[PDB]
Amino acid sequence: SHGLFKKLGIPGPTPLPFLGNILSYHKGFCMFDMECHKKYGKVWGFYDGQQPVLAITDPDMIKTVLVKECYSVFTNRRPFGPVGFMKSAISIAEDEEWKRLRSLLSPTFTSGKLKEMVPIIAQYGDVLVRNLRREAETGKPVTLKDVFGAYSMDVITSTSFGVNIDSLNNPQDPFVDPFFLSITVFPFLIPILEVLNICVFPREVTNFLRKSVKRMKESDFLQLMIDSALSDLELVAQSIIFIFAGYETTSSVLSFIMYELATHPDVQQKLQEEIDAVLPNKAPPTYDTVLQMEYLDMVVNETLRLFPIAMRLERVCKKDVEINGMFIPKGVVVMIPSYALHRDPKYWTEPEKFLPERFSKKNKDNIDPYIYTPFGSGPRNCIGMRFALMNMKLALIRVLQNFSFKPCKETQIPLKLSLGGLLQPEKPVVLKVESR
Amino acid sequence: SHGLFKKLGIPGPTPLPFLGNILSYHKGFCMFDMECHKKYGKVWGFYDGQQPVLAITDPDMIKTVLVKECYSVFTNRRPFGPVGFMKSAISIAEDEEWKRLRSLLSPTFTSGKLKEMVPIIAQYGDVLVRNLRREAETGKPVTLKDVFGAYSMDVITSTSFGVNIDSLNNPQDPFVDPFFLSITVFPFLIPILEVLNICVFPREVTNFLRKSVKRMKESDFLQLMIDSALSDLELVAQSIIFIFAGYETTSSVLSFIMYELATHPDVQQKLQEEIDAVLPNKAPPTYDTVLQMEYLDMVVNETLRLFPIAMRLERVCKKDVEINGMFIPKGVVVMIPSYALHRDPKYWTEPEKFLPERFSKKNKDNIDPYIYTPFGSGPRNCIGMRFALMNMKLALIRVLQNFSFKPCKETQIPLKLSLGGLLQPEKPVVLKVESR
Ligand code: HEM
Numbered sequence: 099s100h101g102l103f104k105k106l107g108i109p110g111p112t113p114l115p116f117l118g119n120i121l122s123y124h125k126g127f128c129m130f131d132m133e134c135h136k137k138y139g140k141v142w143g144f145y146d147g148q149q150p151v152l153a154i155t156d157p158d159m160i161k162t163v164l165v166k167e168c169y170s171v172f173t174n175r176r177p178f179g180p181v182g183f184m185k186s187a188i189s190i191a192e193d194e195e196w197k198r199l200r201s202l203l204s205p206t207f208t209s210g211k212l213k214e215m216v217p218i219i220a221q222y223g224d225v226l227v228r229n230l231r232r233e234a235e236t237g238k239p240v241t242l243k244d245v246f247g248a249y250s251m252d253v254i255t256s257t258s259f260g261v262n263i264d265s266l267n268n269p270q271d272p273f274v275d276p277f278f279l280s281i282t283v284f285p286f287l288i289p290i291l292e293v294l295n296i297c298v299f300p301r302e303v304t305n306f307l308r309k310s311v312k313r314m315k316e317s318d319f320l321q322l323m324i325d326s327a328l329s330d331l332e333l334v335a336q337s338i339i340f341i342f343a344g345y346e347t348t349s350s351v352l353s354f355i356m357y358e359l360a361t362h363p364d365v366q367q368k369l370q371e372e373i374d375a376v377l378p379n380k381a382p383p384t385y386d387t388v389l390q391m392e393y394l395d396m397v398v399n400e401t402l403r404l405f406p407i408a409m410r411l412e413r414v415c416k417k418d419v420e421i422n423g424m425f426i427p428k429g430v431v432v433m434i435p436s437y438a439l440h441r442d443p444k445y446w447t448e449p450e451k452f453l454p455e456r457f458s459k460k461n462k463d464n465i466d467p468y469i470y471t472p473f474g475s476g477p478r479n480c481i482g483m484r485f486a487l488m489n490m491k492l493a494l495i496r497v498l499q500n501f502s503f504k505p506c507k508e509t510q511i512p513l514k515l516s517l518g519g520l521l522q523p524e525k526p527v528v529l530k531v532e533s534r
Numbered sequence: 535s536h537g538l539f540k541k542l543g544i545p546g547p548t549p550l551p552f553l554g555n556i557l558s559y560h561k562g563f564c565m566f567d568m569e570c571h572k573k574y575g576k577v578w579g580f581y582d583g584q585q586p587v588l589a590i591t592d593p594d595m596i597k598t599v600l601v602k603e604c605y606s607v608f609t610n611r612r613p614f615g616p617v618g619f620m621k622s623a624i625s626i627a628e629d630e631e632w633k634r635l636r637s638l639l640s641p642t643f644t645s646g647k648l649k650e651m652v653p654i655i656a657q658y659g660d661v662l663v664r665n666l667r668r669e670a671e672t673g674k675p676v677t678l679k680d681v682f683g684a685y686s687m688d689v690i691t692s693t694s695f696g697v698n699i700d701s702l703n704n705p706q707d708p709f710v711d712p713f714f715l716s717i718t719v720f721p722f723l724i725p726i727l728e729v730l731n732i733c734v735f736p737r738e739v740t741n742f743l744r745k746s747v748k749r750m751k752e753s754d755f756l757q758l759m760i761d762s763a764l765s766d767l768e769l770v771a772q773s774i775i776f777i778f779a780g781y782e783t784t785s786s787v788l789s790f791i792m793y794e795l796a797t798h799p800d801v802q803q804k805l806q807e808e809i810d811a812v813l814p815n816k817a818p819p820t821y822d823t824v825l826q827m828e829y830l831d832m833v834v835n836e837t838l839r840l841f842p843i844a845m846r847l848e849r850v851c852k853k854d855v856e857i858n859g860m861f862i863p864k865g866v867v868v869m870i871p872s873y874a875l876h877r878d879p880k881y882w883t884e885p886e887k888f889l890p891e892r893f894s895k896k897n898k899d900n901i902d903p904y905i906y907t908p909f910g911s912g913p914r915n916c917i918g919m920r921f922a923l924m925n926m927k928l929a930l931i932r933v934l935q936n937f938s939f940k941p942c943k944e945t946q947i948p949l950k951l952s953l954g955g956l957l958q959p960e961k962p963v964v965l966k967v968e969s970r
């Protein structure tokens with residue numbers, strides 16, 4: 099079906115047999131979407147192997163796909179690799195099976211349940227200072243992904259189950275393209291690996307959590323789920339997605355934020371002045387305190403514009419439909435390039451620069467909510483959106499109250515992204531930390 | 535999932551790993567269903583490899599599966615082998631795709647369109663006498679599947695497209711378990727054969743018909759289809775099912791009928807007296823003439839009771855449902871053993887005997903329409919039901935008007951069925967033919 103986009107009148111790169119357009123991923127995932135958006139315009143198509151993928155940039159077509167016709171056509175994402183038992187994961191699940199998981203897990207991410215976890219995750223904000231006060235008084239560059247990754251991992255274990263550890267102080271068992279590139283080009287190898295108990299995840303784990311959730315089902319995220327019903331294998335499958343999310347997401351974004359604050363001291367100083375103004379004399383941050391700091395929100399929102407760790411938003415077309423005046427055949431994965439839309443002169447002035455004033459209450463009104471979608475949109479959006487921003491800002495407040503950040507001789511200026519498809523820096527961010 | 539029927543409280547034979555219960559098919563398809571119906575009762579389950587199959591015998595549960603909840607749950611049959619392009623076949627098609635094919639092909643099998651083909655198929659009733667008058671005046675046993683197979687094949691070509699041939703007189707190009715046993719046990723090999731252009735059918739054919747239907751689409755079943763729209767590959771796919779049906783079905787049933795008439799001369803004499811009474815002095819048969827002969831219908835209906843060439847009626851359970859007080863999980867193929875229901879003392883007296891008076895207008899009322907389903911039931915039933923009985927009876931009238939049938943020294947008495955799963959005799963039926 100390599101002539102589908104050419105028989106529909108949709109431009110795009112010429113695909114190769116079997117391979118399709120995956121050879122154009124040598125520059126990276128984001129560079130491929132920006133080049134295709136530059137030479138093809140608002141709509142183009144390419145092939146991930148034999149699978150056709152359609153990209154859209156029009157805000158009305160994106161609104162129709164993600165918000166309007168979500169339950170009817172664009173309900174699921176594309177199926178990937180051997181999932182093993184993980185089929186029941188809310189993000190892997192499809193159709194009405196997901197609608198039950200989305201509903202049974204929606205109360206866990208409410209405006210009231212989030213405030214319950216504020217006194218818990220604020221404790222690790224004090225622990226992060228202790229590990230910082232040790233790596234700052236030692237007076238030498240510090241790798242941010244380790245300290246932030248430890249904070250995020252301890253926040254996960256306490257808010258998911260309630261296990262209080264110090265992932266940085268006890269580094270003995272803190273839990274935690276080849277095989278799969280051939281999987282995308284050869285989708286007919288997925289069922290064979292499923293019948294052989296082979297999973298993309300290291301399947302020998304999971305059974306740890308499958309048996310770790312035993313003393314808890316006899317006497318946070320977990321307590322607010324079993325009480326009602328969810329299965330035992332489902333309950334472990336959902337907790338694996340909650341760990342994979344809150345770890346790599348919170349760790350990578352915080353490292354991206356501290357890079358911009360260290361490379362723009364005018365933004366870090368203005369942010370530290372607002373934090374000290376709302377919280378005088380290193381006051382503890384509360385739920386209502388975080389929702390008040392607007393410049394802190396402007397810094398978080400602008401960094402997510404530059405580095406949306408999702409990169410892409412994918413939806414599977416369930417039936418032959420016609421949205422906003424164009425036909426889409428059944429089986430085509432409709433992709434929304436979030437990275438390419440965030441760095442486009444059509445909607446952003448100086449898209450390569452870091453200007454937090456783009457999200458000021460005066461300028462936040464002239465921003466299309468479907469061009470800037472770091473958490474997706476519609477029913478299939480990020481269920482842990484409000485939980486993520488609260489955990490990151492609570493860490494940002496406690497960190498900036500005691501320390502400042504300056505670049506180092508090893509700091510990569512400018513910063514280069516990873517060559518893979520994790521949206522992490524090429525080299526781990528290292529900065530100089532000084533105590534106030 | 536070899537413990538599904540044991541965790542639901544459903545009896546059945548103990549399955550083996552990978553194989554399941556296919557090793558119990560050494561006796562045959564029909565003998566396996568009759569033994570399971572004898573020792574397990576009204577409901578049992580077995581495994582065709584890793585696929586669970588549930589068998590039902592209750593008339594209300596069969597009515598619910600085939601008639602009531604057909605469009606909602608029991609819409610499709612099980613998927614079989616690499617279909618290639620034949621996916622679009624009305625019998626292979628599934629869900630709304632079939633509902634369009636069933637509707638676009640329904641007018642071709644109406645009470646009015648059938649009468650148009652009566653003067654056409656009555657012509658080959660005269661040709662069958664000529665081939666009979668040759669093989670009867672030669673005074674020697676005649677193989678019935680060859681002469682009837684020639685009649686059925688010429689009736690197909692004339693009513694489908696309009697090509698008048700004599701498949702018995704011109705035997706030079708009259709058109710027309712290993713590979714697949716491993717396919718049932720290993721369903722994960724189907725997609726690999728699809729991507730290699732490999733089909734269960736000899737794929738090098740079809741393209742003949744794909745190009746044979748070229749002079750007709752520029753200037754019967756075919757004319758009543760294109761006029762409206764159906765695709766070109768669909769149009770050839772539907773004609774292949776129409777040929778496979780009207781050939782093996784008409785040929786095998788007619789051979790089964792003439793075996794019973796030759797082994798029960800009291801039935802053949804009574805049938806010949808009714809044919810000569812309705813049609814005096816070898817009169818030509820019409821559409822209204824066939825619908826009048828009731829004993830001819832009693833002979834055809836009783837033979838279809840003994841030899842229902844379908845054997846099984848299969849439906850795929852689309853969702854978790856509960857019919858008549860029992861739960862059926864999603865993905866289970868619900869099978870209706872038509873052969874076992876036809877030879878059951880619960881509904882039939884002397885089920886091994888051939889008694890045409892079971893379908894008399896006095897006795898036809900006390901017969902459950904869901905125990906006797908030679909053409910299925912509901913929306914997914916045989917679309918060529920009324921077309922089949924008209925073609926067979928029109929041949930039965932013209933044959934019995936000129937010749938009688940007696941057994942031979944090679945005639946297998948009693949008759950043994952084939953060891954495979956085609957419901958044909960083990961040895962081809964041969965009888966002695968005499969001219970009246
Ligand atoms: C900086 C942090 C995060 C970002 C930027 C982010 C972003 C996203 C995005 C873009 C999507 C796809 C939306 C779509 O396809 O329409 C998504 C889905 C999802 N996220 Fe996150 N997320 C973050 C943190 C989290 C956290 C902390 C959790 C859970 C504790 C979480 C759980 C999920 C789930 C379950 C889905 C799939 C929902 C579904 O398929 O219906 N995420 N997220």
Ligand code: HEM
Binds near residue numbers: 632779784848
């Ligand atoms: C003695 C002759 C025949 C017998 C006993 C017979 C019997 C059957 C049976 C039992 C079914 C399955 C019903 C079900 O699953 O509910 C079926 C389906 C079907 N038959 Fe026949 N049939 C005969 C002749 C024909 C002819 C002559 C044609 C076409 C010209 C035909 C076309 C079909 C089709 C297309 C289906 C599938 C319908 C669907 O899937 O919706 N059959 N038949």
